Write a protein that binds this DNA or RNA. Structure first.
Lengths: 159, 137, 204
RNA sequence: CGGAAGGGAUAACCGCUGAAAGCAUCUAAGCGGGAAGCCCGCCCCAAGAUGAGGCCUCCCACGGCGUCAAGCCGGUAAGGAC
RNA sequence: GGGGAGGUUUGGCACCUCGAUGUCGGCUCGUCGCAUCCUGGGGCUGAAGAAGGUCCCAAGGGUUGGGCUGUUCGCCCAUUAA
RNA sequence: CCGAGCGCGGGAACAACCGAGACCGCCAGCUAAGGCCCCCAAGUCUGGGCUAAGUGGUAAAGGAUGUGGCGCCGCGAAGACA
C-alpha cells in the first residue's frame, strides 16, 4: 500500500489513492488494524463462518487498494466477419449481427478505450464494476458455439 | 366478595419499535392492550393502556421472515386468496404488520375489537401529540 | 393528463380522402375550471370542470357561493379530470388536435333487469327436443355437496347496463372550434344527450 | 375499442467480485441480468374503509318545560321531502 | 431388483345413509389441480441453420367443426398454436 | 376402557390415548395428566450444548466439501497439499 491512505469507520473502509477513493463496506465483526505503511485484518475466533469473513475482507481490501494503485483494465476480444468496434465519444458502439448496431452506455467510474475493432479494454477503479461492465459486453453477443464469432476474453474459445 | 372496579381513566403509552423484535413487541403491546399488568384487573370491562407505537416501519424480524413470512387474506370469489409476504408489507404500509401481530393475540370477540381502537400504530415516528404519551420501554 | 367534458349529440359518418370514417359527435362547449386540487391542501391534483349553463333558479343551492368564489357562471354539472391543470381561464376543444387519440368514458344504456342470455351472452338451452322450460335458462349453478355454496359473482340474471364504462384509443377525427364539436371513431357508450368525459389516451 | 407499453419484485436459468479451502466456486458477505407468470399499470366496484375519510361552498344560539344530568316540546335556517 | 408419491382405474372392508343419498351419456354452467396440449422463459443435445428430442419454470390465458357410436372412449375426416 | 363414565382435566376440536370413578354445598388450599410469550391460568426462570431449515410444524429407498463432534491410516520442515 504505497501512497495509499487506509482509514477506519463504524462499518466500512475508505481508500484514498491517485486514481480516486471508493467506499468498501466490510464485515462489522473484525479488526481493521492500520499500522504505519501496512494494513491487516484479524478475526474474533476460529469458527467456520469467521474463517470465511476473515479471508474475504483480507482480499476485498487488497483490492479496494489495488483499485486506486494502477487501476484495472479488462480486455475483450471481438471475432467475426462484420464484427468491429467503434468508440463513439466516451461510449462504445459496435456492429455484431442484429439488424441495428447497438450502443454501449458509459457506467460511472469506468472509461473503456480500444486497441482494435477487435480488442476492447475496460478501465475501472472498482474491480467489481470492471468485471460487471465487461461481462455485460460479452452478453450482447455470446460466443458462436460452432464457429468463432462474437465476444470473447483472452480465455480460450469454444470450438 | 371480590373487588369489582369502577370508572377509570386510560393511560396512553409512547412505545418505540426501532430494533424491537416483532412478536416480543407484539406480546407486551397486547398484554398492555388489556390490563393484565394492572391488578386493578377486570376481564370484561376493558381498560387497557391505549398502546401507541411510532417508527413501526422499523421492526426487526427473525430468520428470513422478511422474504419468507406470508400473510394470507381471502376474499369471497375463487382464487381470491391474495398472498402477501413481509417484503411487500414493509415497503407499502409497514405499520400494518405489527397490527395483525397484536390483533391476532388479543381476545377474539366484542371487547377484543374494543381492544383495537386502543392500538395506535404509526410510521415516522411522530403521532398525535394530543394529551398523553407516557414513554415506556 | 388532458381532460374535457361533454355530451353525445349523435353519430353518423364522414369520408377521409376516399375512405369512410364512421364518426360520433361529442360536445365540449367551453368548460369552466370550477375548482382545482392542490396536494398542498387536497391530497392530490385534479381540475373539476363544470358544464352546461344554468339559470340561478335551480342554483338556489349553496353552489352559488361556490361559483361566485371561482367567478363562474352557475353551471348544471361538474366533475374531475385527473391531474389536469391548464391555466387560469377555461378549456375549449383546442385541447385536442385532430388525429390525437382519446380515452372516452360514459354511462351505458340501461337494459333493465336483463336475462342471462343477454347479460352474459350465455347459451341457455335448445329451442327443441325437450324440457320446454329452460330455453333462456341459466343452467346449473354449482356442484353437489362440496362446496355446497355458489361462487361469489357467478354470472346470473341481474341488471345489464347503466354502468360506468370507458372506451379508449380513439382517433379524434376532426375538431370544430367554430362551434365546439368533437369527431371520434363512432363507438361511444351512452345514449344521445348523454354526459361523457374525454381525455388524452394511454398509448405511452 | 381493448389483450398492451412501461416501472418494480421474481421462477428455472445465465453472470461479476469472493472465502471457507494459497487453486477454484453464481454465495456463505455484496451486486447485476432473467417469464404470457407475481406487484403496480388498464377498466369497473368501493368510506356499513362501524378504522364510516378528505376537499369547496351555504345555515347558525334557547323560542318553553328539565336547577344540577343527558334530555324533552312547538317553530325555524341551509336544505330535504311530499 | 428396490423405494415412493398420488387417490383419476379394477378391487378390498361394509363405517354414515334402505320411515329413499335418483345410476350412464349428452346439453347448460362451470370451478379448481399441475403431473403443461399450446403460447412465454430456461439447461443439455448424438443442437450447423431451419426443425426437432429430453429435462426445468410456469396456470395467465387458450384448448376447433364434423362423420360413426346411447355412448365416456376411440376411429376417421378438415383444420389447429394446441 | 367406552359401552352403562358423550360427567370432569389434558390432548385444538374427537366413547374408548395420558389424567381421574362426579351424594350435595363453598368466591378455601394440594395435586394428576398437561402445561407456564400472547388468544389462556401460571417461568419470556437458571445453567450447558445442539439445530438455520420454519427443520420444529410429522413420509421411504437413495443422494451430497450442510454443522458440530469423536476416532483410524498415508504424506511433511532432508520442504509435502494447492
Amino acid at each position: 500500500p504505497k501512497g495509499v491512505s487506509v482509514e477506519v469507520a463504524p462499518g466500512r473502509v475508505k481508500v484514498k489513492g491517485p486514481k480516486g477513493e471508493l467506499e468498501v463496506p466490510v464485515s462489522p465483526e473484525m479488526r481493521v488494524v492500520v499500522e504505519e505503511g501496512v494494513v491487516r485484518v484479524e478475526r474474533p475466533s476460529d469458527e467456520r463462518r469467521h474463517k470465511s469473513l476473515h479471508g474475504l475482507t483480507r482480499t476485498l481490501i487488497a483490492n479496494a487498494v489495488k483499485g486506486v494503485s494502477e487501476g484495472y483494465s479488462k480486455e475483450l476480444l471481438i471475432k467475426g466477419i462484420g464484427y468491429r468496434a467503434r468508440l463513439v465519444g466516451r461510449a462504445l458502439e459496435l456492429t455484431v449481427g442484429f439488424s441495428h448496431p447497438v450502443v454501449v452506455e458509459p457506467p460511472e467510474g469506468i472509461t473503456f478505450e480500444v486497441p482494435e475493432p477487435t480488442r476492447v479494454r475496460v478501465s475501472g477503479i472498482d474491480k467489481q464494476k470492471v468485471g460487471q461492465v465487461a461481462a455485460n459486453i460479452r452478453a450482447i453477443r455470446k460466443p458462436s458455439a460452432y464457429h468463432e464469432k462474437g465476444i470473447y476474453y483472452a480465455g480460450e474459445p469454444v470450438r | 366478595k371480590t373487588y369489582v372496579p369502577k370508572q377509570v381513566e386510560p393511560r396512553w403509552v409512547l412505545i418505540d419499535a426501532e430494533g424491537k423484535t416483532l412478536g416480543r413487541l407484539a406480546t407486551k403491546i397486547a398484554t398492555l392492550l388489556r390490563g393484565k399488568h394492572r391488578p386493578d384487573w377486570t376481564p370484561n370491562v376493558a381498560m387497557g393502556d391505549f398502546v401507541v407505537v411510532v417508527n413501526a416501519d422499523k421492526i426487526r424480524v427473525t430468520g428470513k421472515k422478511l422474504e419468507q413470512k406470508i400473510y394470507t387474506r381471502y376474499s369471497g370469489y375463487p382464487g381470491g386468496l391474495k398472498k402477501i409476504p413481509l417484503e411487500k408489507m414493509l415497503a407499502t404500509h409497514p405499520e400494518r404488520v405489527l397490527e395483525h401481530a397484536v390483533k391476532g393475540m388479543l381476545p377474539k370477540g366484542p371487547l377484543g375489537r374494543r381492544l383495537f381502537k386502543r392500538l395506535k400504530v404509526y410510521a415516522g415516528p411522530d403521532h398525535p401529540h394530543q394529551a398523553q404519551r407516557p414513554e415506556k420501554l | 393528463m388532458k381532460g374535457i367534458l361533454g355530451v353525445k349529440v349523435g353519430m353518423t359518418r364522414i369520408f377521409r380522402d376516399d375512405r369512410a370514417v364512421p364518426v360520433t359527435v361529442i360536445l365540449a362547449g367551453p368548460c369552466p375550471v370550477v375548482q382545482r386540487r392542490t396536494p398542498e391542501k387536497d391530497g392530490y391534483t385534479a381540475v373539476q370542470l363544470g358544464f352546461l349553463p344554468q339559470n340561478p333558479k335551480r342554483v338556489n343551492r349553496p353552489l352559488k357561493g361556490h361559483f361566485a368564489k371561482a367567478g363562474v357562471e352557475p353551471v348544471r354539472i361538474l366533475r374531475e379530470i385527473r391531474d389536469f391543470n391548464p391555466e387560469g381561464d377555461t378549456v375549449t376543444v383546442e385541447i385536442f388536435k385532430p388525429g390525437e387519440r382519446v380515452d372516452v368514458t360514459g354511462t351505458s344504456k340501461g337494459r333493465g333487469f336483463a336475462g342471462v342470455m343477454k347479460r352474459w351472452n350465455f347459451a341457455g338451452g335448445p329451442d327443441s327436443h325437450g324440457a320446454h322450460k329452460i330455453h333462456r335458462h341459466p343452467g346449473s349453478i354449482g356442484n353437489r355437496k362440496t362446496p355446497g355454496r355458489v361462487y361469489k359473482g357467478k354470472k346470473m340474471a341481474g341488471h345489464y347496463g347503466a354502468e360506468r364504462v370507458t372506451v379508449m384509443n380513439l382517433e379524434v377525427v376532426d375538431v370544430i372550434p367554430e362551434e365546439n364539436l368533437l369527431l371520434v371513431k363512432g363507438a361511444v357508450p351512452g345514449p344521445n344527450g348523454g354526459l361523457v368525459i374525454v381525455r388524452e389516451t394511454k398509448k405511452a
